[PDB]
Amino acid sequence: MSPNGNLIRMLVLFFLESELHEHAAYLVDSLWESSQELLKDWECMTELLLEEPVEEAMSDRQESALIELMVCTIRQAAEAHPPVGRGTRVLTAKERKTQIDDRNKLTEHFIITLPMLLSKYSADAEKVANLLQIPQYFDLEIYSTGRMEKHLDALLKQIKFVVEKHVESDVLEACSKTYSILCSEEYTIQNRVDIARSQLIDEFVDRFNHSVEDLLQEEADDDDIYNVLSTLKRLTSFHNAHDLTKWDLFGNCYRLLKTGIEHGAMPEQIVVQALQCSHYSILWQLVKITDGSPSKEDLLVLRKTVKSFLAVCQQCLSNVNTPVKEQAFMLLCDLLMIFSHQLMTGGREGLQPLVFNPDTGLQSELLSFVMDHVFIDQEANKIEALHKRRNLLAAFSKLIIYDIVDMHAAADIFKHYMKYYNDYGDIIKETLSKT
Ligand SMILES: Cc1ccc(NC(=O)c2ccccc2C)c(O)c1
């Protein structure tokens, strides 16, 4: 009760104070054979996080660490195997009997408790985003069984509160996934969740649309810019896993982008988002046309939209801000691969009119950006910045293999930059071997 509250309050210390476990998930896994009972006392944890102290309190850092360890205990219990990167795998009678029971306990528990956790820590992005990893492991049918409808409203009350307080990519993406999980995976609750959502959205589209109109008509306030980007972000986040096509968002994005090309004076994050949103709008328009039995005008309407957007993305390569160029490029290398001749695979030859071949002028810019923004001259930030350029190239690499860009002009650049490996490599190899 308080005995297990000591063991866990010291476990959060042993993890934070010693460098002996860098990864929470690995720590929990290592103790799991020996210390399962203790590590599945979720009532003990949720207590320590919600209670007020008598004496000694918890530190913001230690709180964050309990939340993180907790989620890792919830996963290991649900999945009933060591985490990604410690695995090997056939449960026995009892192992499976235990798993079902653990899933029951953490669902029955967290349905009640997770609304309250979110409540208290509502403004802590890192904490909120880590708590929202928990529903995926719910036995969601129990939002019926336990007559627990009151608590599902309570999660949704709190998820609404978070998205309304937050603009960080981690929180919103975390909130979005949670809605996807609460939806599809049991009809019983699907209808209730669907409404809380499409009302959540409506409030944000009305807010975005007014902001957009505010911005463009205006001299343009620091607020005008706050409001446009603030709302857009919430919607872009959601539009990846949520089919927001019914709200014509592509329209206002396309205006913001067009205003930022024209008068050259659109803030860099508005543009990047405005893009990423448009792109999600387009992918969703495509799916409805793939799975439907679509008409001639249908194809030709989406086509006109795609060709107008491919031009925006191309144009946005010229934007001063390199975050824009990177996005612009990343979408160009995606879109040109999607609306390639591959689109006519699986007897879907009806889609010919959608296919796009990128011109010389565009191909010469898709080379430009590589030479300028992959292959540059000159701590934690830089290993991350590298894997990005890596991805930017790997996504351009796909266009080279299927001759969507001039493959010869590309390999000529790959010559020019790999020179010092062709020209001096052997000599540097055998040298470093003998030291
Ligand atoms: C995703 C995202 C990023 C940034 C912002 N907002 C701001 O940057 C902002 C707003 C008003 C006054 C000062 C600042 C710095 C936002 O709303 C959404």
Swiss-Prot record:
Disease tied to this protein: Intellectual developmental disorder, autosomal dominant 47: A disorder characterized by significantly below average general intellectual functioning associated with impairments in adaptive behavior and manifested during the developmental period. MRD47 patients manifest developmental delay and mild to moderate intellectual disability, usually with delayed speech.
Subunit description: Cohesin complexes are composed of a heterodimer between a SMC1 protein (SMC1A or SMC1B) and SMC3, which are attached via their hinge domain, and RAD21 which link them at their heads, and one STAG protein (STAG1, STAG2 or STAG3). In cohesin complexes, STAG1 is mutually exclusive with STAG2 and STAG3. Interacts directly with RAD21 in cohesin complex. The cohesin complex interacts with the cohesin loading complex subunits NIPBL/Scc2 (via HEAT repeats) and MAU2/Scc4. NIPBL directly contacts all members of the complex, RAD21, SMC1A/B, SMC3 and STAG1.
Family, similarity comment: Belongs to the SCC3 family.
Phosphoserine: residues carrying this PTM: S293
Subcellular location field: Nucleus; Chromosome; Chromosome, Centromere
GN (gene name): STAG1
Function according to Swiss-Prot or TrEMBL: Component of cohesin complex, a complex required for the cohesion of sister chromatids after DNA replication. The cohesin complex apparently forms a large proteinaceous ring within which sister chromatids can be trapped. At anaphase, the complex is cleaved and dissociates from chromatin, allowing sister chromatids to segregate. The cohesin complex may also play a role in spindle pole assembly during mitosis.
PTM comment, free text: Phosphorylated by PLK1. The large dissociation of cohesin from chromosome arms during prophase is partly due to its phosphorylation.
Protein name: Cohesin subunit SA-1
Organism: Homo sapiens (Human)
Biological classification of the source: Eukaryota, Metazoa, Chordata, Craniata, Vertebrata
